[PDB]
């Protein structure tokens, strides 16, 4: 019927920072693993951070923004993604959200976005 | 309601180029991914390239197709191009224009153009 988006993590840090993100999907998936995150800055349009598609990591997407400092991954063991996010700045700052990517329905699915506020 | 046109797609020989574009109209706000999807016979619908909006984002390619492939925006006409180079028979599909506003879950889904590369 429809696919839901268990999302974990989110806080306060400062510049240079560390957090993770976890996304588990689950419902009626189809089997299909296109995840990601995107995240919605105060003033912004939307970025899409990064993105990640079947069990073996293919079409890996980084936002240039956040090369070098995000990374996605999966845990097959799950059906979890995370997003490390590591030597985090100010303009960081956002709200986070998990997406799948539904290419059967044509339906991007949105996990519960979680601030992450990075300052000095 | 958003409305898509598509053009471009054909035949080509191998090594060949063609340029497909996509053309949303209507409720389309200005804040929207737009990109393609390719269906070969038999196989699910293929993430091949998406833009967005956001300038601050570089397009994004599908492994299959980097390299080959480049995307690019016509703000001005809300249109995006697909210029695909280098072409191979394991490029022919039904290639489909998709369309997204940043603040929709559902994608308007394009009709589809023929792409047939061969011999
Ligand atoms: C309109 C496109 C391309 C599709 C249509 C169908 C679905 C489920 C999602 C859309 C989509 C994005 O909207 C955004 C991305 C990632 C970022 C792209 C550009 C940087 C992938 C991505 O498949």
Same mark, same amino acid.
């Given at each position: 019927?429809?696919?839901? +988006? @268990?999302? &974990?993590?989110? #806080?306060?840090? @400062? $510049?240079? #920072?560390?957090?993770? +993100?976890?996304?588990?999907?689950?419902?009626? /998936?189809?089997?299909?693993t296109?995840? #990601?995150?995107?995240? @919605?800055? $105060?003033?912004? %349009?939307?970025?899409?951070?990064?993105? *990640?598609?079947?069990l073996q990591?293919?079409? +890996?997407?980084?936002?240039?923004?956040?090369?070098?400092?995000?990374? *996605?991954?999966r845990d097959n063991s799950k059906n979890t993604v995370?997003?490390?996010?590591? &030597?985090?700045?100010? %303009? =960081?700052?956002?709200?986070?959200?998990?997406?799948?990517? =539904?290419?059967?329905?044509?339906? %991007?699915?949105?996990?519960?976005?979680? @601030?992450? /506020?990075?300052? &000095?």
């Open positions: 019927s429809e696919v839901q +988006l @268990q999302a &974990s993590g989110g #806080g306060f840090v @400062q $510049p240079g #920072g560390s957090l993770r +993100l976890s996304c588990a999907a689950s419902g009626t /998936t189809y089997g299909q296109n995840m #990601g995150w995107f995240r @919605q800055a $105060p003033g912004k %349009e939307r970025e899409f951070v990064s993105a *990640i598609s079947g990591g293919r079409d +890996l997407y980084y936002a240039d923004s956040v090369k070098g400092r995000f990374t *996605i991954s995370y997003l490390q996010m590591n &030597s985090l700045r100010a %303009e =960081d700052t956002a709200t986070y959200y998990c997406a799948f990517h =539904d290419f059967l329905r044509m339906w %991007e699915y949105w996990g519960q976005g979680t @601030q992450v /506020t990075v300052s &000095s």
